[PDB]
RNA sequence: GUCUGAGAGGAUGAUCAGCCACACCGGGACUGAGACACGGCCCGGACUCCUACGGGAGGCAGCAGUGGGGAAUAUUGGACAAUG
RNA sequence: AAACUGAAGAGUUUGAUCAUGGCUCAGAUUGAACGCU
RNA sequence: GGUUGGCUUAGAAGCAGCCAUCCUUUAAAGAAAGCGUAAUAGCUCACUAGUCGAGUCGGCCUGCGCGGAAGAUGUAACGG
């Protein structure tokens, strides 16, 4: 159970969530054994305080049986542990959560949450005056090439990329002259082409695009584009268009995507000014917590890294300030669960004074 | 008469010594600016460790300039420089200290801080 | 008595802290000793003069909108959210009784009812506080439109005694008004 | 002279006393036995303030004290009774 | 008569040793600051 | 009226969707043809009775018409 469709449902007791901050890199991560033995004591401790000894002690050596082959010079950012009684599951993550211990019947999956609410799936159009090809790309990988083994392109009325610009003018025949100045023309009708092609296979899947390429050559498929208003990105100083391989563009175009990513949080505030003048929005933790829990709220804004602890009772639909170690982490299931949307705003964009919100469903 | 690209001394202590006008502000086509009148102005030339450093972009009001400024009398005012006072993003002056004469056509709502804290105006 | 919100507080070289607001009661005037009661605890103090408009005023009188230096007291002791008061006239408190009226969805307020628990934003005079309020006992909803008597604890103390009026927001949206009927300890 | 050192040396030049230099910055002098004058003058300058916008005023490195800087250094006291 | 009175070493390189040699410490002092009192 | 049909779903109450279309007071009233609600609520409809009083309703085919119908020197797409 190494997922977040796995980890949300199996619901232990006691179930333990350790989170350990790693490094990637030498020396930094010379300090990540010590971060693990360190959560652990806590953990331990914890375990004996609040439980028996003998379900500390196998949760523990659980534990430990998994992190003694636990090799530190491929940590990712963040080791997040999901012990129980009987099983034990650690992922490594390259989202940043602060190191803390949760001991609750459900795993602390938040984080999870936020990897993957902060998910963009993409396509790349790479611009040539020779050439263009397409990539689709999930975060940060390359998730296809679109090369002539594909199935998108088996039923095309367009030209198949990768899209070479076989023009008259390229080849030298067919009725041109260079002293006519044809040549910009000739580039926005073959960028036009490449848009035909990147709309019959967009009808197919709908995600947003980014265009990649020179300055020129983006300037001419923006004036050129049918749907002008799926792009999201435009880079103009990735390097190897035509040679470099999709991974590559990938890198290349994170910079972009991460900037999409904050114009995303920065346009959900406005939906919270609406839900804020139309008399739907919840910024109290008591009132947050009934309503998810009741099943009231269709979209939560944390403020990424918002944390409490306090006392949670099923019952009276009460929440008193501090127990429940992530409070906001059950308001978060509980909005996850009765079909609602999660929404981590930046710090910089959300205040610190009002962390939390809940656009309710009535 | 103040166009774009024509340089201006600094009647004001915001840092900048010389600026440069890059557009005359108020209409499509608008060629001149004279007394009163708003402009781009380029920082050309400032003070070290000043407010202002060379090359931003702001706004300034024209304070004297050598074609003049006509008075209702038919009489005309002319100054042996171009000056201007430079003005934050809302038009408004930054300054605390005015250099040499103004004249009354400043006088006003917005720049009444310049015509207040001007040595003599006319 | 004497009693005058902290609205602005900056500082004059050779002269002293200045702290500006409206004199709500009483007058201040050069030799005055008052006491700034508030967020923090009380500092006594003493009046060297009053302004306005960078002049100096014969005295400050409930109503204008006077300026007051305060002898000693540098500017990061004084913020905005304290009153300036007599000594002993006023005391900082925490925890109190009110008369909290729930607004209506017809006036603004909210559809959803203040349960025990709640913790909005109280505003005293000139400042914000977060404030759990605690039912009565024997109750555990109060719907918008009513008015009951409920206890607060400020995260904070708030100077204030019986009689003051505040008002409850969640956001910049008013949700309640309420008036002080006892202040306990 | 002070600290250190057995000494020779080394480090240092608060408080007390002698000498020198300076008095917001640059410059000039007047009066006088004595000054190029800390709480005098003239000119210029920066800064601060008053103005009726024409013009004016000012200098705590005196003693208290303020703001500021700082790790950090005090009273907005009394008397000329004593020595000057 | 007197002003003529004053001088300590230790630890640490080596398997051990002697030497060399740096580092460190025990003293005195202050217009001292800070912490506890 | 059983009844918020069962399921599903945060909620699914005639009216998101999936599976039946049953019964009762009936002159008649769909486990509902629409609007509406987060869901209920609410407004209609189908249907029935009453009023009035004579023809009326909806498909099919066929002829001729209407819209769909924006361009560059000047009407400028009957030669007038």
């Known amino acids: 159970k190494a997922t977040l469709k796995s980890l949300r449902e199996t619901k232990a007791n006691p179930a333990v969530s350790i989170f350990v901050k790693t490094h990637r890199e030498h020396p930094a991560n010379d300090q990540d054994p010590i971060a693990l033995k360190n959560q652990l004591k806590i953990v331990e401790e914890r375990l004996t305080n609040e ?41 490594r993550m390259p989202l940043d959560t602060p190191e803390r211990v949760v001991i609750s019947n459900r795993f602390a999956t938040r984080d ?59 080849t030298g025949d067919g009725g041109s002259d260079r002293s006519a100045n044809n040549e910009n023309s000739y580039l926005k009708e073959f960028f036009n082409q490449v848009d035909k092609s990147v709309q019959e296979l967009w ?142 705003m930046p710090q910089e964009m959300m205040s610190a004074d009002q962390p939390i919100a809940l656009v309710t469903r009535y | 008469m103040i166009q774009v690209e024509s340089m201006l001394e600094v009647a004001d202590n915001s840092g900048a010594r010389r600026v440069q006008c890059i557009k005359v502000l108020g209409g499509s086509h608008r060629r001149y600016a004279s007394v009163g009148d708003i402009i781009k102005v380029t920082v050309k030339e400032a003070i070290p460790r000043g407010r202002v450093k060379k090359g931003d972009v702001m706004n300034a009001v024209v304070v004297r300039t050598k074609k003049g400024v006509r008075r209702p009398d038919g009489s005309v005012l002319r100054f042996d420089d171009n000056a201007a006072v430079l003005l934050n993003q809302n038009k408004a002056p930054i300054a605390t200290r005015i250099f040499g004469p103004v004249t009354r056509e400043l006088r006003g709502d917005q720049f009444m801080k310049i015509v207040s804290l001007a040595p003599e105006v006319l | 008595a004497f009693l005058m919100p902290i609205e602005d507080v900056f500082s004059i070289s050779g002269r002293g802290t200045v702290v500006t607001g409206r004199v709500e009661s009483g007058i201040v005037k050069v030799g005055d000793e008052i006491e700034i009661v508030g967020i923090r605890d009380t500092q006594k103090t003493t009046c060297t003069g009053v302004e306005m408009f960078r002049k100096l005023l014969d005295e400050g009188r409930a109503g204008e909108n006077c300026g007051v230096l305060l002898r000693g007291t540098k500017r990061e002791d004084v913020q905005r959210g ?93 949700v309640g008004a309420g008036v002080v009927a006892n202040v306990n300890v």
Do not use: W
């Open chain 1, 203 to 344: 009808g197919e899947h709908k995600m947003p695009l980014v265009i990649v390429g020179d300055v020129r050559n983006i300037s001419y498929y923006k004036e050129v584009c049918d749907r002008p208003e799926n792009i999201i990105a435009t880079v103009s100083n990735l390097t190897e268009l035509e040679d470099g391989n999709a991974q590559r563009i990938i890198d290349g175009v994170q910079d972009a995507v991460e900037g999409y990513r904050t114009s995303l949080h920065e346009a959900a505030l406005g939906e919270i000014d609406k839900a804020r003048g139309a008399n739907a929005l919840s910024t109290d933790l008591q009132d947050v917590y009934r309503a998810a829990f009741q099943g009231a709220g269709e979209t939560l804004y944390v403020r990424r890294g918002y944390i409490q602890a306090a006392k949670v009772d099923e019952d009276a639909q009460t929440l008193t300030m501090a127990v429940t170690d992530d409070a906001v982490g059950l308001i978060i299931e509980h909005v996850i669960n009765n079909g609602g949307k999660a929404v981590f």
């Open chain 3, 82 to 174: 304290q009153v300036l008061a007599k000594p002993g006239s006023i005391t900082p408190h925490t925890k109190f009784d009110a008369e909290v009226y729930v607004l209506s969805k017809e006036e603004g307020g909210r559809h959803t009812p203040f349960l025990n628990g709640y913790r909005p934003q109280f505003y005293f005079r000139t400042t914000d506080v977060t404030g759990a309020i605690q039912l009565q006992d024997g109750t555990e909803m109060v719907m918008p439109g009513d008015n009951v008597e409920m206890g607060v604890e400020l995260i904070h103390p708030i100077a204030m005694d019986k009689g003051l009026r505040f008002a409850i927001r969640e956001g910049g949206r008013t």
């Open chain 1, 51 to 91: 439980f028996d000894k003998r379900t500390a002690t196998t949760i523990l050596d659980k534990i430990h049986a998994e992190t003694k082959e636990y090799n530190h010079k491929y940590n990712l950012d963040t080791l997040a542990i999901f012990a129980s009684v009987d099983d034990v599951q650690l992922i």
């Open chain 1, 112 to 170: 999870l949450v936020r990897d993957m609410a902060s998910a963009v799936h993409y396509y790349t159009v790479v611009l040539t005056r020779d050439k263009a090809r397409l990539i689709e790309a999930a975060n940060d990988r390359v998730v296809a090439e679109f090369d002539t083994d594909n199935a998108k392109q088996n039923n095309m009325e367009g030209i198949p990329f990768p899209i070479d610009n076989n023009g008259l003018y390229t």
